[PDB]
Design a protein around this ligand. Sequence first.
Ligand SMILES: *[C@@H]1O[C@H](CO)[C@@H](O[C@@H]2O[C@H](CO)[C@@H](O)[C@H](O)[C@H]2NC(C)=O)[C@H](O)[C@H]1NC(C)=O
Ligand SMILES: *[C@@H]1O[C@H](CO)[C@@H](O[C@@H]2O[C@H](CO)[C@@H](O)[C@H](O)[C@H]2NC(C)=O)[C@H](O)[C@H]1NC(C)=O
Ligand SMILES: *[C@@H]1O[C@H](CO)[C@@H](O)[C@H](O)[C@H]1NC(C)=O
Lengths: 50, 50
Amino acid sequence: LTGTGVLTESNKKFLPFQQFGRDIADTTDAVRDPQTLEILDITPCSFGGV
Amino acid sequence: YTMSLGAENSVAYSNNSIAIPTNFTISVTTEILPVSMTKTSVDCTMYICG
Ligand SMILES: *[C@@H]1O[C@H](CO)[C@@H](O[C@@H]2O[C@H](CO)[C@@H](O)[C@H](O)[C@H]2NC(C)=O)[C@H](O)[C@H]1NC(C)=O
Ligand SMILES: *[C@@H]1O[C@H](CO)[C@@H](O[C@@H]2O[C@H](CO)[C@@H](O)[C@H](O)[C@H]2NC(C)=O)[C@H](O)[C@H]1NC(C)=O
Ligand SMILES: *[C@@H]1O[C@H](CO)[C@@H](O)[C@H](O)[C@H]1NC(C)=O
């Protein structure tokens, strides 16, 4: 699962079988690191209109 | 069921009778009107291609 984002610590407690996380709009906003079983929030990079 | 438009009200019409109000009700009613929407902007290049 690839993408671009800011990976921060997450307070979402995944169940042990779950790996990725999606919001209402089916975009990956939470993920589990495969090396160390920790949950990371994926905040989209700060795009903006100039 | 077949719907009913309203209760029947046969007005007591005659050529020399009038109905005059002897009292009044100060009635306040609500009218809700939408004015604006959410202002949305889409980066077309990022939406199509990232
Ligand atoms: C004015 O008079 C008419 C008749 O004299 C009244 O009309 C009647 O009202 C009753 C009440 O519902 C009905 O049962 C009758 O069928 C009506 N008759 C007719 C010919 O319409 C009327 O109500 C009176 N108006 C007021 C404000 O008292
Ligand atoms: C006109 O209507 C108003 C109410 O719609 C009447 O005021 C009421 O009068 C009775 C007895 O006089 C009181 O018990 C109520 O408390 C009053 N209501 C309010 C809201 O003040 C008034 O009397 C009527 N006038 C006529 C000439 O019929
Ligand atoms: C995988 O390697 C990491 C590296 O230290 C280790 O902490 C972890 O226990 C290993 N096993 C699993 C199942 O993640």
